[PDB]
Amino acid sequence: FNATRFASVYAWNRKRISNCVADYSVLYNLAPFFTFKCYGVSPTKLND
Amino acid sequence: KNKCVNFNFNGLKGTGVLTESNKKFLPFQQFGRDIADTTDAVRDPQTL
Amino acid sequence: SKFGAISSVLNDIFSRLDPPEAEVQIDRLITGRLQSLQTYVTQQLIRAA
Ligand SMILES: *[C@@H]1O[C@H](CO)[C@@H](O)[C@H](O)[C@H]1NC(C)=O
């Protein structure tokens, strides 16, 4: 999320996340993240 | 074990009694479903 | 049967979704299961005749 480098919407960058403990509060707590829309899952339940 | 307990095995929420299973799970299997998608058995993600 | 819902298991629906839009899927599943049980009882009455 905090990487300085973001690819174009074509040849879009893709990163696989495996074998870790996530904490989504570090994401939606950020001020700039004005838009946070989820399909099939809710923001509050991501950590559970 | 052997007591009615609410369980959350790796995100699978439910209520039931947990007993040492006697069905030979192959080493590459991680769940057991009865008829109609009901989770019959599950392996502990810590002690396996 | 999912009856058009996201998942056939209620626990996944309740865990994944907050109550507002979770209730929509729960309503769909409940309507489907009520319809199935009503059909079962209707068939039982017909066979009981
Ligand atoms: C998980 O940690 C427990 C406690 O240290 C240990 O007994 C168990 O073997 C570990 N399991 C795995 C799969 O690492």
Q: Report the alpha-carbon distance of residue C39 to residue C32 in Å, rounded.
A: 11
Q: Tell me if C11 and B14 make a contact (CB, 8 A cut-off).
A: yes
Find, among C4, C25, C30, C22, the residue nearest to A42 by Cα.
C22
Give the burial class of C47: count Cβ atoms within 10 A of its Cβ; 0-12 exposed, 13-18 middle, 19 or more buried. exposed
All residues of chain A having their beta carbon less than 8 Å from the beta carbon of residue C22 are: 42
Nearest CA-CA distance, residue C7 and chain B, Å: 11
Three-class DSSP category at B41: strand
Q: What is the resolution of this structure in A?
A: 2.9
CA distance A24 to chain C (A): 14
- Whole-Å CA distances, B22 to B25, B34, B46: 9, 15, 19
H or E, element range at A15: none
C-alpha B48/C-alpha B21 separation (Å) is 12
Q: At which residue do the structure tokens 């960058």 appear?
A: A13
* Cβ(C23)–Cβ(C31) below 8 Å: no
Ligand 1 centre to CA of B32 (Å) is: 22
Q: Which residues of C touch A48 (CB under 8 A)?
A: 15
- Cα–Cα distance, A33 to C21 (Å, whole number): 22
The pair of structure tokens assigned to B32 is 């057991």
